[model samples]
Target: SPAPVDLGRAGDFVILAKSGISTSGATHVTGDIGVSPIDRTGLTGFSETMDPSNTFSTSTYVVAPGKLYAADYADPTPAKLTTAVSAMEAAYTDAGGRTGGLSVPGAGTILPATTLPAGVYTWSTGVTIPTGVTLEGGPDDVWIFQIAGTLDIATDMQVLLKGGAQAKNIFWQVGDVVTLHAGSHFEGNILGFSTIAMQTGASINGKLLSQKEVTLLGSDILTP
Candidate 1:
């Protein structure tokens, strides 16, 4: 089996963005989230309150009892975020640079019902999970997707995991922005360049690590 794509220290958070992270409405996250190189102002809509030590901040948005982090925080906070962001970028490169078997099936569009297996799939064209798909594999199997374009998980659709497949083992490396449409569902660690956005009611059972921003609206992130 192919080795897993290690996220390094970046895996420590549910969301890690470089530029900023903004949210609106009722947003819920089950793990820590943070922004860096943008300062505390980069975090929006949480009404965050800094702790006395300034090591991290708390928010009503972090209902999962998760703390918020910003570059403007205390010393260790800044350095730690720097490392996490660095690891995020490195993981992105690692995923993108992966070379493997040829032929990107479906031209990046899976129209009929599909169930993907363990392997590495690269696509210059964006990938669209149209009718909903399944990823089936054993617990230790790994799947890495390298997409130079964007990704769209159809509205109201979810990626099903069968035969003991785990969301934590699937990695999505994207060149452009990613949109988990309204009421859509996702299962994978998304490594993106600019933004990874979740529209109204969208939910993900994975990680979203973006280079720029991660915007959410009335969403829930049930981290794997």
Candidate 2:
């Protein structure tokens, strides 16, 4: 029912975290990824190659042309990370601040094969997606989910988009950890307070902007 939340500079990152970002297995990211207020050491398993001047780094885990950054990098980069992270929190606040919304449409659990349109959905008890759920809307439509607890997208599930719905227009503001289980497919920007974990083989066509850390295991991230 409302417009898309402003992500500000944070929109530049597909994965942004304040604590750390680590990956295992064959995790692949298609956009810029970074950690703030944490040094390069905070990033692990990437076996990253630093730029000559240390402004940023790159990894085989991230698709070619995708860069990785940390707070302890060169001057301008450190400043940018600080501001980008600030924008992320602000976006989360904006989403959670929505006044008009549905209350746990599926009792905080989005059932398999359910279809939903554009609007705000609030849940104080968290959200569980057991399997497939479809979001149907136009290109300009927006959906904001304000969740006070964790967001769990179960294994082997798919969050499908139809009727022109695009992942960039969907937002999930979660107060706790966000878990994308093994083999799950997701679509949306997740602004989370705690760790965001992607299990083996999970894939997301969205951003993972976490206040804390982000851990990926053989996951695939396609920045929307």
Candidate 3:
């Protein structure tokens, strides 16, 4: 099987957006959050002011043990943000170039209560999670899902991990949009070409790196 995609410096960010990151309600992120190419204005729903030390909390969003970086922040210029964006792109390319394993068809919900092993899964069309899906593997095992279209998870759907599976070992390369509906729980490193939307009560135990924007509402994103 193909090797796992390396995130490089980009892995340091739990949430990284090329355009903007819009959040509503109470969204808690356990790692650093960043926005590039666009300014801090790209980030909405948080307090206008930020603590540069990477330690602070606001009513709308919270970043614990990691700082928030943007174009208009205290330093105003974070080379790391640019580096992370490049790394994200490189990771996306690596995931896409990998040879396939399972070939999911162009229409239908691919992973519903299915237990998947560590391998590369390719889909020509959109992939959806209408019910719970499980990743069953060891900690060293890796899974990469190359999606040519969008990825959607229905409300209250879940991507469960078993047999010592880790979220960091899973990667999702999406060509278009990625949406996680309300109360859904996801686990993986999402490298999105366009947008990633997380509805109310949605939770992700992984990374959200988008070439466009990421919308969150009452979500909890914890990097693993």
Candidate 4:
């Protein structure tokens, strides 16, 4: 591996954390958003893919298949990496957008599209699925707000989930398991307090952090 390009600056790109970077996934991103090769100018491979490496290898940055610890790399010390992670975590927390947690919505508030009152309601019954309720957002404009209950996209209808300017910020808090069966096109992260299962053709746009193991069946996981 040789220096693909000459980056005039010392730090051309920043490697946040090691991620499994590959072109194979349900969600597709172009430019510096996803996995890409570094140009000869040393400014390349700045996508959501993981394994942000500075080596001159053809694949400058990579998204790993599994966990990517901050200790794997030698350049970006663990301390620096920890700081960045903390900052991101704080931002995520301060955003006040944790889905599936115990939180009540305002009064007279319906879920979304429903004539019912729009108030934060808990899933009194086990796994209260939304009736014809579909979640959607812009490619880079919609962000998943606070979700305090389990969400299941209906099979009969389409769930158009959207995210804010930063697609990576979209979060889905699942008090229970968030199940996406076959033919389901799920965009954004499924932050499950339990597990997240994706059937065939089901695609996600964020990481799957759960108390249980995440099982992917003919699906893909997206990360930033």
Candidate 5:
């Protein structure tokens, strides 16, 4: 059998079967569950939790909020460049004199590469290189000096090398990267605060430092 129905608002209860005047049995049930909503505020912290005297033991992970992970890689800043160059000039002058300060075995003062107080020693005139010469740095962290004049290497001599063996000792610490012009041979270390680029067929026999990335210009022997 089918029945006609009215789709209207009803009060209290509605009869689904015979309901003229009937009463029988019924059931009732109830339970309870409580919950606390969580707070949705986003917060972060910035702090340096490492010792300044020690090298970073682990690779640093840098993440800026709402942005992709950008690296905080170590490079030479502008102030650092100025400091480096000043230190090198001071060391050069302090070593021996403007004429013959630091000594490399087997070579005399070809162009008086010694460090002097405030005077510009231009390399407008070409200089000679000492044979079996090992040009070393002064006592400080490698990146502690800068050179403001031109450096010319002779044909017979090669730069003896050090640095990059332990940790901090192997850097060049120069404010400006050395641009090897034609017919130049570098045999020592180069620690530049910016970048170190090599030319084709040129060679270096020491460690390299570039605050950014290093690109190979030519085939060269590198230790660090």
Candidate 6:
């Protein structure tokens, strides 16, 4: 099996978007959030008022334990964001290059609830989770899913982790959009080529790194 891809500095962020990050209602993020290339104007619905230290303090749209970094933040600079973006792209390339894995053909809405061991999973088209899906493996085990198209998780669906599986070891390489429907729960490090949309009340215990934007609605994203 291929080894887990290293995220490097990009792993420090819980939510990293290239274009922008838009939010609705109250969204809570437990780790650092970053928006690259675009300036602070890319961040919508959050408190624009910065403290004397130029760090985000309080906001109804987001509750982040770590500070938010934007292209306008001089302390970190846009160069840091560039580095992270490069890392994300490199990780994506590394993941896509991995071969010799299970071939899941025509992955439609129906997904068996059985446990999956550590390995690379590939799909030629989109993949949807209509119900709950379990990933059973040790904490050190790695799981990588390379989807040529979008990845959609239906409303109230879940991506459960068992057998000491850690969210950090799970990677989802999406070619297009990734959507987590309302009230759904997900676990993995999503390296999306396009947007990642989280509907109302959706929760994720992993990283969200999008080459495009990340839209949230009353969602909870916690880094593990």
Which one wins on TM-score? Answer: 2
Separate clash counts for every candidate: 0, 0, 1, 39, 15, 0
Model-by-model lDDT, in order? 0.88, 0.93, 0.85, 0.37, 0.27, 0.85
Comparing candidate 1 with candidate 3, which one achieves the higher lDDT?
1
Cα lDDT tens digits, model 5, 138-171, are 3332221223322334433444433322222322
- Cα displacement (Å) at residue 5, model 2: 0.6
Candidate 1, position 132, lDDT: 76
**lDDT, candidate 1, 60-150, per-residue tens:** 8787478999998998999989999999999999888888834445888976777888888888888888777888899999889888998
**lDDT (tens digit, per residue) of candidate 6 on 1-224:** 35998988789788899999888887888887789888888888877567577744335554544767788876655777889988999988888778976875335453566567889998878889887688888989999998889999999988988899889899999999999999999998999999999999999999999999999999999877
Which rank order by TM-score, best down to worst? Answer: 2, 1, 6, 3, 4, 5
TM-score of each: 0.96, 0.98, 0.92, 0.44, 0.31, 0.93
Which scores greater on lDDT, model 1 or model 5?
1
Residues 96-153, candidate 2: write the lDDT tens digits. Answer: 9998988755788886568989999889888999976899999999999989999999
lDDT, model 1: 0.88
Whole-model lDDT, model 5: 0.27
Candidate 4, residue 9: the lDDT equals 18
Pairs in clash, predicted candidate 3? 54-67
In candidate 6, which residue ranges exceed 4 Å CA deviation? 55-58
Give candidate 3 regions above 4 Å deviation: 52-60, 74-77
TM-score preference between candidates 4 and 6, better one: 6
TM-score of candidate 4 on Cα atoms, chains taken together: 0.44
Tens digits of per-residue lDDT, candidate 3, 74-145, equal 442467788889999999999988985587543647544578889999887888888868889998899999
Q: Give the per-residue lDDT of model 4 (tens digit) for 1-224.
A: 11111111111112221222222234322112211121122212223323446322222123333222232333543444344434433433432342333433333122556321122223332343343344433343333334444556544333444232233534444556667765555554444545456566665555554433344454544544
The list of candidate 5 runs beyond 4 A from truth reads: 1-133, 136-145, 148-157, 160-171, 181-185, 212-215
Model 2 clash pairs are none
